[PDB]
RNA sequence: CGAAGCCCUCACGGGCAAUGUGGUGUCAGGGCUACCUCUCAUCAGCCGACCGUCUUCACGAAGUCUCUUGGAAUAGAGCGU
């Protein structure tokens, strides 16, 4: 909520999580806020995901400002458990990162372009 | 590094854990990269006392002889261990 500056539509979120499911079975993904943060700093992150139901908000707070100065695109997911299942975990995830997509590079590029049109 | 982990249960199965279980590491700084050599340090775990001290216990030598006094010798004198 405090780190959220734009609302992402349910349709765009469906596209995003589907692209993440095929990113783990082909390319490579980073699961968890610590690994997502290191990906943005190292530059290896292509697209970063962030949950909106994170309590406390401090865990994720830095991602929207850190990604802006590193050129890495970010998208908001409504639920924590949906992002965790999409990353391939039994538990939830506050943040996920796509470190070089696989056979979804065209979809990821479009998601990154649809988010910029939504500010 | 990133699920490689932990708890419950005979098992099955369940719970925990990416908001990080677990590995690494902790100022002789450490990590990472490139190498030299090596370990007996440390940490985890198995085994597991001696001696001493405190207390309790077993065993454990040699007269119940003479006389006098006395209610009674454990006294005096004498002999003996
Ligand atoms: Mg350790
Ligand atoms: Sr959770």
UniProtKB/Swiss-Prot annotation:
Give the intrachain disulfide bonds: none
Q: Where would you say this protein principally sits, based on its record? A: cytoplasm
Localization recorded for this chain is: Cytoplasm
GO BP annotations, alphabetical order: ribosome biogenesis; translation; tRNA 5'-leader removal
Q: Which GO terms describe its cellular component?
A: cytoplasm; ribonucleoprotein complex; ribosome
Record keywords: Protease included? Answer: no
Q: Which UniProt keywords apply?
A: Cytoplasm, Ribonucleoprotein, Ribosomal protein, RNA-binding, rRNA-binding, tRNA processing
**Care to name a GO molecular-function term for this sequence?**
rRNA binding
Which InterPro entries does the protein's record reference? eL8/uL1-like, Ribosomal_eL30-like_sf, Ribosomal_eL8-like_CS, Ribosomal_eL8/eL30/eS12/Gad45, Ribosomal_eL8/Nhp2, Ribosomal_eL8_arc
Q: Does the keyword Ion transport apply?
A: no
Q: Which domain of life is it from?
A: Archaea
Biological role stated in the UniProt entry: Multifunctional RNA-binding protein that recognizes the K-turn motif in ribosomal RNA, the RNA component of RNase P, box H/ACA, box C/D and box C'/D' sRNAs.
As for family, the record states: Belongs to the eukaryotic ribosomal protein eL8 family.
What quaternary structure, including any partners, is listed in this protein's UniProt entry?
Answer: Part of the 50S ribosomal subunit. Interacts with protein L15e. Probably part of the RNase P complex.
Name of the protein: Large ribosomal subunit protein eL8
């Amino acid at each position: 909520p405090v780190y959220v500056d734009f609302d992402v539509p349910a349709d765009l979120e469906d596209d995003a999580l589907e692209a993440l499911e095929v990113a783990r079975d082909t390319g490579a993904v980073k699961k968890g806020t610590n690994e997502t943060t290191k990906s943005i700093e190292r530059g290896s992150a292509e697209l970063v995901f962030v949950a909106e139901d994170v309590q406390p908000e401090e865990i994720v707070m830095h991602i929207p400002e850190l990604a802006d100065e590193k050129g890495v695109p970010f998208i908001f997911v409504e639920q924590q458990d949906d992002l965790g299942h999409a990353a391939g975990l039994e538990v939830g995830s506050a943040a996920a990162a796509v470190t070089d997509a696989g056979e979804a590079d065209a979809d990821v590029e479009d998601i990154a372009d649809k988010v910029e049109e939504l500010r």
